[PDB]
Design an enzyme around this catalytic site. Structure first.
Site, PDB file in Angstrom:
ATOM      1  N   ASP A  90     -19.157 -38.910  -0.705  1.00 27.21           N
ATOM      2  CA  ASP A  90     -18.470 -37.860   0.051  1.00 27.21           C
ATOM      3  C   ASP A  90     -18.403 -36.569  -0.747  1.00 27.21           C
ATOM      4  O   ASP A  90     -18.585 -35.480  -0.192  1.00 27.21           O
ATOM      5  CB  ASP A  90     -17.027 -38.250   0.367  1.00 27.21           C
ATOM      6  CG  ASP A  90     -16.907 -39.428   1.283  1.00 27.21           C
ATOM      7  OD1 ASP A  90     -17.876 -39.774   1.980  1.00 27.21           O
ATOM      8  OD2 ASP A  90     -15.801 -39.997   1.314  1.00 27.21           O
ATOM      9  N   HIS A 124     -12.847 -37.065   4.383  1.00 31.39           N
ATOM     10  CA  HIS A 124     -13.161 -38.476   4.146  1.00 31.39           C
ATOM     11  C   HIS A 124     -12.813 -38.864   2.721  1.00 31.39           C
ATOM     12  O   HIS A 124     -12.191 -39.908   2.487  1.00 31.39           O
ATOM     13  CB  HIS A 124     -14.640 -38.751   4.423  1.00 31.39           C
ATOM     14  CG  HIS A 124     -15.064 -38.413   5.817  1.00 31.39           C
ATOM     15  ND1 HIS A 124     -16.384 -38.417   6.208  1.00 31.39           N
ATOM     16  CD2 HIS A 124     -14.345 -38.031   6.898  1.00 31.39           C
ATOM     17  CE1 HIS A 124     -16.461 -38.041   7.475  1.00 31.39           C
ATOM     18  NE2 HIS A 124     -15.236 -37.816   7.920  1.00 31.39           N
ATOM     19  N   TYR A 128      -9.798 -41.698   1.250  1.00 33.81           N
ATOM     20  CA  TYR A 128      -9.925 -42.795   0.305  1.00 33.81           C
ATOM     21  C   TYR A 128      -8.795 -42.664  -0.714  1.00 33.81           C
ATOM     22  O   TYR A 128      -8.069 -43.605  -1.032  1.00 33.81           O
ATOM     23  CB  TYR A 128     -11.287 -42.914  -0.391  1.00 33.81           C
ATOM     24  CG  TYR A 128     -12.312 -43.316   0.604  1.00 33.81           C
ATOM     25  CD1 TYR A 128     -12.207 -44.592   1.189  1.00 33.81           C
ATOM     26  CD2 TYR A 128     -13.384 -42.481   0.931  1.00 33.81           C
ATOM     27  CE1 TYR A 128     -13.135 -45.040   2.117  1.00 33.81           C
ATOM     28  CE2 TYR A 128     -14.323 -42.938   1.876  1.00 33.81           C
ATOM     29  CZ  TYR A 128     -14.197 -44.212   2.462  1.00 33.81           C
ATOM     30  OH  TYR A 128     -15.177 -44.544   3.367  1.00 33.81           O
ATOM     31  N   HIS A 218     -22.870 -36.530  11.972  1.00 32.19           N
ATOM     32  CA  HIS A 218     -23.563 -35.793  10.913  1.00 32.19           C
ATOM     33  C   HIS A 218     -25.008 -36.253  10.795  1.00 32.19           C
ATOM     34  O   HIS A 218     -25.927 -35.438  10.662  1.00 32.19           O
ATOM     35  CB  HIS A 218     -22.875 -35.973   9.559  1.00 32.19           C
ATOM     36  CG  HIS A 218     -21.476 -35.456   9.507  1.00 32.19           C
ATOM     37  ND1 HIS A 218     -20.719 -35.492   8.356  1.00 32.19           N
ATOM     38  CD2 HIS A 218     -20.691 -34.899  10.463  1.00 32.19           C
ATOM     39  CE1 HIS A 218     -19.527 -34.980   8.606  1.00 32.19           C
ATOM     40  NE2 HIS A 218     -19.477 -34.633   9.881  1.00 32.19           N
TER      41      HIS A 218
END
Ligand SMILES: [Ca+2]
Ligand SMILES: [Ca+2]
Lengths: 313, 318
Positions: A90, A124, A128, A218
């Site tokens: 990410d 994103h 986490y 995406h």
């Protein structure tokens, strides 16, 4: 000398700001025109990605604490490591890969769609972190970061793709960008799908599904733009690009197999996650307009895992 | 006698991905660590900007149609041109200026905060488009785009800042980025506030206030990072940077005066908008840690304008 009055003649007389900057500070700069969308697909994608906005604090991960506490320290370590490795991917997408697609754009609207992609993949990574804040100890968090930097099989997947983001070749850069959400995602996503099938971490699973919802778009959008540019190339240059795609993918498949074997060795999940990963490599090729060469046994996915794509535990 | 006796050592043994590329593809890459935030200001700003997410669907712009129809074609044209010029500034920020700050960052978290800034200013540009879709004819929209590209006083303001985004000097790039939300915005924002102080286009000014809420933070944060880095530099370099800031701001002020005189020339608003602009130039300097040299006379704003500028922004949720 035109006999028809073409609308929006200013557009052909001007350049976007990034084109001004790239071409030596030359030209009259135009504003984005959201009232004249050159490719209606850009408006469709902008609308869906912005309607899909979310943040991790909207999900009560604290409601997963009892489920988390049923997992052995070994399983908790695996989850923290796997997710921290995804956080690295990410971070690369948000700060290097997606922002490198801005100057590669066919339209002004695509330029800013990729800024949305970069921001959302940063969300994103944030999510986490949010999961770890709620569930993990300080030691678990730190040990996963040290494992990420020191695990060579993990590092090599990222090192293979980052050089393409110079945009020395914009189409190669776009392929390398799409391989993050379109392929490397899935070897790690096997783990939450497996845990979800076993009724573990339901709230964390909601965040995984929100991340997946963004990543699918995406990958799709980059493949859409890849195909649009490639179809305009010569048959020779199209063949060179197709051989590039297959070559890079096979290279990444081998790097991913080595990583997943190390990540999942103690748990027996590597063979299943690899087939799951290779299945999504096949879909990645289709997303770019090509045919999957992979066999059924190469790509076999159990139903409890396969549905989430849309005694021994 | 007595018995003779380091957290997060991995961080010093690794680099961020953008660094890894910067260093010539060298180093072990670390993931962002949202559980160990090196500068708490970054967490505060991330939380603020994300909780302030909005889209133009939040505002019932069609309720401005009755008041729009009371404006003459000349006023409607002025509004469309002014806003399209602001959309150009938004476009530069979203695609060049804010993106360019990512590698200039002092922390991993700052890298992604600037990706939020770039996306949100893209939303600002999309919001102008929403206003135009609701109020303007296709002819008015196209006229304004053609005027934007052909008006040299407008273009010159953008052309003065863009070269700094190459990051040959990261602090000059950061100043030139902050001049967009911290200064060039305000000469244009004078117009909607002037109108809404007179009961015209009230819902449009609600859009403007949502944009302003974001732009204020963008300017504040760039100034915070500018000050943090400058404070560690030699006295010679700090004074060089101060001179650069004042020189560039004064040159931008001159370009902005020329543009606002041309833009507002038939309407009598240029002298007032210029004072409003220079007021915000003074605040820009204070935000980088400098003192404003401008006089009360150079910066007078009428109370009804200040009321519009300072009003707070807002069952629809995101
Ligand atoms: Ca197995
Ligand atoms: Ca006046």
């Amino acid at each position: 000398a035109s006999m028809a009055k073409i609308k929006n003649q200013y557009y052909n007389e001007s350049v976007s700001p990034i084109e001004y900057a790239q071409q030596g500070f030359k030209g009259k700069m135009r504003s984005v025109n959201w009232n004249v969308v050159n490719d209606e697909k850009d408006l469709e994608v902008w609308n869906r990605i912005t309607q899909n906005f979310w943040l991790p604090e909207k999900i009560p991960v604290s409601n997963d604490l009892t489920s988390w506490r049923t997992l052995t320290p070994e399983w908790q370590e695996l989850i923290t490591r796997t997710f921290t490795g995804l956080t690295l991917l990410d971070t690369i997408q948000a700060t290097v890969g997606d922002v490198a697609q801005v100057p590669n754009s066919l339209t002004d609207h695509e330029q800013v769609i990729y800024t949305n992609f970069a921001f959302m993949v940063a969300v994103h990574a944030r999510s986490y972190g949010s999961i770890f804040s709620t569930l993990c100890s300080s030691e678990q968090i730190e040990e996963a970061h040290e494992w990420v930097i020191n695990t060579e099989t993990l590092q090599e997947r990222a090192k293979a793709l980052i050089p393409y983001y110079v945009n020395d070749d914009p189409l190669k850069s776009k392929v390398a960008a799409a391989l993050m959400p379109g392929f490397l995602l899935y070897g790690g996503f096997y783990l939450p799908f497996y845990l979800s099938a076993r009724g573990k971490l339901p709230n964390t699973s909601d965040i995984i599904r929100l991340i997946l919802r963004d990543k699918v778009i995406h990958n799709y959008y980059s493949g859409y733009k890849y195909q649009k540019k490639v179809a305009k190339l010569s048959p020779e240059k199209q063949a060179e690009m197709k051989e590039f795609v297959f070559k890079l993918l096979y290279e990444l498949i081998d790097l991913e197999k080595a990583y997943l074997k190390e990540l999942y060795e103690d748990f027996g999940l590597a063979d299943d996650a690899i087939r799951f990963s290779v299945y999504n490599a096949g879909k990645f090729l289709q997303n770019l307009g090509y045919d999957s060469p992979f066999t059924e046994e190469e790509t076999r996915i159990e139903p409890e895992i396969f549905t989430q794509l849309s005694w021994e535990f």
